């Protein structure tokens, strides 16, 4: 319902947010795209999800030595100010292909909140063309944060998302 | 700037709000409409503003015995759940006339935050037809709150505003 949706988003946007809680388990974001922390990445070969890809956004190249997973490494510095905007289109195009091929992919960083959360937020914004960008940003942000406990908490990352995906009509 | 505006509103809406601070001084909201607490109402006859009206939303009828001010009394119960929506159109039509006649009016309650703040928020929403209601609600709410320190903190009042002024396009 529009009335329930607007009440939810605007109360969340004017003072009613939960304290941030560190996510521990993997979240299915779309049909094939998943969001997680570093433990979730270590557990990916053992997951019932038949992951074809893991997108590793940490600084460290790792291997999953007994796994057929293709680990794509895009190192993002562990900083509250990382230039993630340079990677938005490359990452969302990759995630869109995974959804188009039904090739499950886990996007992760260390805590599964900021670097990986921001790329998931970018992907969802890029997949939207029905809802106004402002409304959709507030909906995705608050509903993902309620689900995960913490989601793109870094103000610089939110700012970069806003500047990329919310300034233009869509 | 659209980019600066969206950054401001959406960062305020996703976790970056100040602690609530009780307002002490009167705020000029429009050309003729002012917002204040109970002390501001007591001080209204002495104000350099030549108030023609005071809108008293407290439960108590008072007089300003050495003053030509017309005190309009609409008692609103001191409750977090008061049905303010019944009074929206009556109050905003009255405030709109004060602006049309250049007849200054002070809207006040006890703390100048919730009952009076909500009627000011309703009035500003009713005066808007250019900006989308969602965007304008977030702009007025956060900018008034930053100015006053506390502004429509009661969730029931925000909900009633949202249901009245934000659900429809405008």
Numbering used by the authors:
A (entry chain A), B (entry chain A): 2 to 171
What does the original paper state about this entry?
Due to the importance of H1 in modulating interferon-signaling and viral replication, it serves as an attractive anti-poxvirus drug target.
To understand the mechanism for monkeypox H1 catalyzed dephosphorylation and provide an accurate structural model for drug discovery, we determined a crystal structure of H1 to 1.8 Å resolution. Monkeypox H1 has 171 amino acid residues and the refined model includes residues 2–171 with well-fitting electron density. Two H1 molecules are related by crystallographic symmetry and form a domain swapped dimer, which resembles a butterfly. The N-terminal helix α1 from each protomer interchanges to mediate H1 dimerization. Size exclusion chromatography confirms the H1 dimer in solution, suggesting that dimerization represents its functional state. The arginine residue (Arg116) of this loop captures the phosphate ion, whose guanidinium group interacts with two phosphate oxygens through two hydrogen bonds with the distances of 2.9 and 3.0 Å, respectively. There is a phosphate ion captured at each active site, representing the final stage of catalysis before the product is released.
